[PDB]
Known about the structure:
InterPro entries (chain B): Homeodomain-like_sf, HTH-type_TetR-like_transc_reg, HTH_TetR, Tet_transcr_reg_TetR-rel_C_sf, TetR_C_31
CATH topology of chain A: Tetracycline Repressor, domain 2
Largest sheet of chain A: none
Radius of gyration of chain A: 17 Å
Protein name (chain B): EbrA repressor
CATH class of chain A: Mainly Alpha
GO molecular function (chain B): DNA-binding transcription factor activity; transcription cis-regulatory region binding
Strand content of chain A: under 5%
Bound molecules: proflavin, nickel (II) ion
DNA-binding region (chain B): 24-43
Oligomer: homodimer
Order of helices and strands of chain A: HHHHHHHHH
Organism (chain B): Streptomyces lividans
Number of helices of chain A: 9
Largest interface: A-B, 39 and 38 residues
Number of strands of chain A: 0
Shape of chain A: elongated
CATH architecture of chain A: Orthogonal Bundle
Amino acid sequence: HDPERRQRIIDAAIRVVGQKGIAGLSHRTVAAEADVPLGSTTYHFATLDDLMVAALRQANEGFARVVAAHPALSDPEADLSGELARVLGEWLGGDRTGVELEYELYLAALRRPALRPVAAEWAEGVGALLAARTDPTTARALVAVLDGICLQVLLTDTPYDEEYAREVLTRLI
Amino acid sequence: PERRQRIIDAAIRVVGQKGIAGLSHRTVAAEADVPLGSTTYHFATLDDLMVAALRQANEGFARVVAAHPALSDPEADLSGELARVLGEWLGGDRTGVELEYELYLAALRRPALRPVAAEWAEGVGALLAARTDPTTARALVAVLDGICLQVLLTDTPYDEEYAREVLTRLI
Ligand SMILES: Nc1ccc2cc3ccc(N)cc3nc2c1
Ligand SMILES: Nc1ccc2cc3ccc(N)cc3nc2c1
Ligand code: NI
Ligand code: NI
């Protein structure tokens, strides 16, 4: 263990990615942005994948916090659809650097097998909140659809339509 | 007209093997055995290169709908029919599936590609939206992406009856 030097490094990885993107993520630049010695970076994350895996892992940590601040998601007395659409609305609107950053790391799992189990983590922990309410097959669905709705906004560059989102989300539950 | 195309076919090859990282104007010119930089005459920025590559790769899907008239048939189980064309694409060699996705998902942070990624989004829409309901039309594309990435990113097999269920719930 060496939490802080390690922790500073991860934060700088996230900072480097959001700024220059996955392409601008090397040990020298993380070392620089973290302002720690190059050897400390190669010591804690031998490979770049290790570093990305830890970064994404941390980005996921934040979704949980968001679910924690919005009790309606756990209140089996509230409209899951309308409530989810809303949270997404808030996440999507309000600095895409955080959004793009997290998504870039996540989508990176497509080619880098290392990131797949950490990608799967996100999903298994998100359907968790939906599976705790509805059945498991509807959870697996929601997590999937929900992803496609964000991607549809982030990729096509067409604004987020909360009502549409709530309707399509409703068709699954 | 045939040099632009040779440069394109090349980029699709570069990505299929080195991913988007390997696409470098010189990597393409090298792959298409064309004068270095000659690629710049047709595509100024790398962004232009990718937009053309994505626009050409994105056509695969239109073809498969053609070879499966059963999807244009208003009186046919779209869900199961779709769940099928999807299992075919996700079950045989992912290099095609991967390179197309990488280019498409690249839109994420390269505004250039947004319009292309959106083109294909309505194409697929109307190409099976006109089957009434505007909503179902745009939600179809999103549910497809989700169903796909859920496979491609977590490294868990494509469950067809599951896809069908989800699709059936949408339609
Ligand atoms: N790949 C994804 C998909 C959906 C997401 C929805 C979110 C909502 C709130 C938040 N704070 C972070 C989120 N991250 C996501 C990452
Ligand atoms: N972004 C996407 C989403 C779904 C897709 C489904 C497909 C099915 C057959 C095929 N030949 C190409 C496809 N491309 C896709 C690209
Ligand atoms: Ni070759
Ligand atoms: Ni077929």
